[PDB]
Amino acid sequence: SSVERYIVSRLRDKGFAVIRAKRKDHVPDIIALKSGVIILIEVKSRKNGKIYIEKEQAEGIREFAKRSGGELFLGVKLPKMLRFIKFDMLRQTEGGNYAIDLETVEKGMELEDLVRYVESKISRTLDSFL
Amino acid sequence: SSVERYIVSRLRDKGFAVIRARKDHVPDIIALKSGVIILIEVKSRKIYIEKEQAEGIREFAKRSGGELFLGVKLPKMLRFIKFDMLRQTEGGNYAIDLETVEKGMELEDLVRYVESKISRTLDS
Numbered sequence: 537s538s539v540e541r542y543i544v545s546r547l548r549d550k551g552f553a554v555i556r557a558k559r560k561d562h563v564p565d566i567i568a569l570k571s572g573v574i575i576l577i578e579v580k581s582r583k584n585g586k587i588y589i590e591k592e593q594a595e596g597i598r599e600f601a602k603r604s605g606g607e608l609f610l611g612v613k614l615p616k617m618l619r620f621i622k623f624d625m626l627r628q629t630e631g632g633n634y635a636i637d638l639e640t641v642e643k644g645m646e647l648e649d650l651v652r653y654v655e656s657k658i659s660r661t662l663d664s665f666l
Numbered sequence: 667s668s669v670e671r672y673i674v675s676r677l678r679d680k681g682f683a684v685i686r687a688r689k690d691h692v693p694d695i696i697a698l699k700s701g702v703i704i705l706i707e708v709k710s711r712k713i714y715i716e717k718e719q720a721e722g723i724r725e726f727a728k729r730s731g732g733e734l735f736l737g738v739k740l741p742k743m744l745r746f747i748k749f750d751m752l753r754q755t756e757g758g759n760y761a762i763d764l765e766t767v768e769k770g771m772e773l774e775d776l777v778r779y780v781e782s783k784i785s786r787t788l789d790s
Contacts, residue, residue, distance in 0.1 A: 552730075553729040553730035555685065557685070571730075573731070603698065
């Protein structure tokens, strides 16, 4: 929440059009737009050692992602750090939920990296070949 | 409020990812589909909007790179006109008469309009 809010602040400062917020569990926590690129972010707070995300919730925000056509990311706030990975990194567990090892998240990207990444996607949009 | 809910339901039945809710400067509706962004400021009823709110939601549109529209509920019809269609007033504000809105697009024309934007998405 405070983490989402803080993330919002940073995205706005970097020029993004950003918004937050019944069907709550299946709507990305953060929806950030900039120059025609859509980035969806689900933020979770975990304070220990594998990160698990519930099946129905994961498939739901995923369907919202496919509809919107936006790039969906998982943002995790560990005790001493904040990370983001592509939601596609979550593998479905035997039981049916989705998870990613905390190792991967730690090596994930920071806000500034998320941003650089988003910027390169904007450039992609404006690029032409030949 | 209900008009919003209506529009929202409608775009949802058409495959759009939709969300509602300065505060005045945010479009009432954000609808997303296949990488296309459509923002809609809802006005239920001559439409008039104060300089700063208009430039305000305009900046959001511009930052977003999205397509900003005015969703208007007239006594007996629902129309959609590009926000760009608002003309500046001598007082420095922005307005549009309902005649222009009337010839605007129906909910269904807006969807096809988006499909066209999506097609074009495939050439870049």
